[PDB]
Design a protein around this ligand. Sequence first.
Ligand SMILES: CC[C@@H](C)n1ccnc1C(=O)O
Ligand SMILES: [Zn+2]
Ligand SMILES: [Zn+2]
Length: 231
Amino acid sequence: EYPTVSEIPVGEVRLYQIADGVWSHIATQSFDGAVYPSNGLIVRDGDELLLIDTAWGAKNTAALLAEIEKQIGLPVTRAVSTHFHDDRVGGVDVLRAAGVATYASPSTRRLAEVEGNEIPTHSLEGLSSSGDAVRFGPVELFYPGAAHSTDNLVVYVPSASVLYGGCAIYELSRTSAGNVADADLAEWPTSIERIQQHYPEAQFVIPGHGLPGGLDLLKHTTNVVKAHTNR
Ligand SMILES: CC[C@@H](C)n1ccnc1C(=O)O
Ligand SMILES: [Zn+2]
Ligand SMILES: [Zn+2]
């Protein structure tokens, strides 16, 4: 069973093996009066690991690296943040000090600097236009357009048919919008449709927060965004 926000003390990180060489990482964080789970991805890259997103904070990201060393025992050599928010770049300094090469699009680095969040060192070129995709080792990076944020990327693992949607994709149990302060509500369904059109073969869909599912998380998210738009 997938670890839920109830089973994880703020400060611990769980790993969940989705497929051969693919895991999600799950942390918890307190925010605005509540506790939320948060997902990222780990993808084996030969004898190294590619990390997708921090574990939401320096303390959680330290624990994430410890859990990876304990349960997998391969070095994290590169990390990609999928947008500029704290649940995605909070902990980047921890990764860089541990020798991880940290990456984000110039869009994400720009917005993180404006916001005062941690800034990944390296830039991912070739993702500034909606529908752009670039290979990054064992994953493909995709910019679907503005959704949860203007810079949000999704990540596809071709070998395992795993689509990591990040915060642009909601889990089924979430029936109201989350933090939409930086969102483009008007474009979000269109951006989700680009994901569906580009990855129709996806078998495992991982939202930014909560339980994984299939491609039906995409239509669920569009439904929730439209309902919010209409409120
Ligand atoms: C999922 C709950 C909301 C508040 N949230 C917390 C952190 N990130 C988000 C998001 O919307 O992506
Ligand atoms: Zn966000
Ligand atoms: Zn988020």
